[PDB]
Ligand binder design. Structure first.
Ligand SMILES: COC[C@H]1Cn2cc(-c3nc(Nc4ccnn4C)ncc3C)nc2C(=O)N1Cc1ccc(F)c(F)c1
Lengths: 332, 5
């Protein structure tokens, strides 16, 4: 059932999640094809929490490089509401699908990275962390416009409560996890997102994930296999003993040079990659510095890289109520 | 290369 009939017809499948499905459909009013995400999350608490945080963020954000919500279709009452349909701009593909078969020119890598960071500056300026940046969450159209999507794992930044023990369970996509997630971090600081963007840049350069860990700790071992052993200064940040002693137990490895991994890459792109893929999250480049890096000089313009107008400062039955309230503005 | 975006 794809019940968007008042004005949306001719549905064609796009993809799915544990609690929803994305389709493409014709908008009988605006005479344009749109994307519609059928979301059926109400039978699972986790699905409800992710749906609510995403709707709340996406309705507040307004940025060219972030997917917006154009319409929300749902029943007029909580009792009758089984599914929620989110209508958004249609994007022809995503960076995951594109990198499966297409080599990117250096100009495409530069422009796509610029747009990722431009959108990320806005996100971070609202004190929000995306926490699941990866190629499939970067939507693209035929004119190379890029929009970040999927804010289901997003959180408000909380650096004071970022500390955790070694091997703490984590939900976001393994291959794009910063090394500190496995060591001592809950992923509540902006540096978590910069690491993922660095992983995406490496993937745009080679068409393959840079750190394809097969399981939790294997992820850290792929990272260290390229970065080499953390320095004494970076080990100064790792004060939890189990994490520290795990790193000290590893054999010494020197750094794999970026120019050996990416021999066809622009040297300025590799200098920016190095700064994004910095082991110490405190030394890792921040989004505004990355925009100002020489690799992005042809696009950089801080006056045209807007920030958010203000920061973004439960059982499944109650979460369903809040989803109903949050979607009320779209009822006629 | 100077792609027109
Ligand atoms: C199945 O999507 C997965 C993921 C990526 N994704 C892609 C898009 C999206 N994709 C296109 N087009 C397009 C892309 C590629 N080819 N094409 C044609 N255009 C517009 C939009 C908004 N939206 C989303 C999205 O929300 N999520 C998150 C999500 C979470 C839970 C769920 F249950 C769920 F269903 C979706």
């Amino acid at each position: 059932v794809f019940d968007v009939g008042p004005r949306y017809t001719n549905l064609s499948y796009i993809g799915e999640g544990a609690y929803g499905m994305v389709c493409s459909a014709y908008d009988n009013l605006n005479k344009v094809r749109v994307a519609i995400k059928k979301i059926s999350p109400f039978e699972h608490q986790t699905y409800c929490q992710r749906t609510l945080r995403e709707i709340k963020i996406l309705l507040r954000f307004r940025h060219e490089n972030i997917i917006g919500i154009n319409d929300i279709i749902r029943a007029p009452t909580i009792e009758q509401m089984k599914d929620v349909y989110i209508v958004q701009d249609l994007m022809e593909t995503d960076l995951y699908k594109l990198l499966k078969t297409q080599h990117l020119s250096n100009d495409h890598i530069c422009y796509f990275l610029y747009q990722i960071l431009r959108g990320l500056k806005y996100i971070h300026s609202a004190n929000v962390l995306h926490r699941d940046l990866k190629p499939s969450n970067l939507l693209l159209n035929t004119t190379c416009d890029l929009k970040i999507c999927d804010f289901g794992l997003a959180r408000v930044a909380d650096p004071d409560h970022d500390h955790t023990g070694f091997l703490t369970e984590y939900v976001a996509t393994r291959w794009y996890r910063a090394p500190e997630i496995m060591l001592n971090s809950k992923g509540y600081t902006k540096s978590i997102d910069i690491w993922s963007v660095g992983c995406i840049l490496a993937e745009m350069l080679s068409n393959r994930p840079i750190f394809p860990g097969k399981h939790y700790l294997d992820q850290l071992n792929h990272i260290l296999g390229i970065l080499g052993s953390p320095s004494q200064e970076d080990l100064n940040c790792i004060i939890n003993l189990k994490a520290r002693n795990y790193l000290l137990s590893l054999p010494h490895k020197n750094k794999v040079p970026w120019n050996r991994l990416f021999p066809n890459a622009d040297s300025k792109a590799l200098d920016l990659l190095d700064k994004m893929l910095t082991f110490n999250p405190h030394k890792r480049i921040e989004v505004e510095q990355a925009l100002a890096h020489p690799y992005l000089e042809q696009y950089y313009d801080p006056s045209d890289e807007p920030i958010a107008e203000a920061p973004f400062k439960l059982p499944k039955e109650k979460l369903k109520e809040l989803i109903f309230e949050e979607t009320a503005r779209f009822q006629p | 290369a100077a792609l027109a975006f």
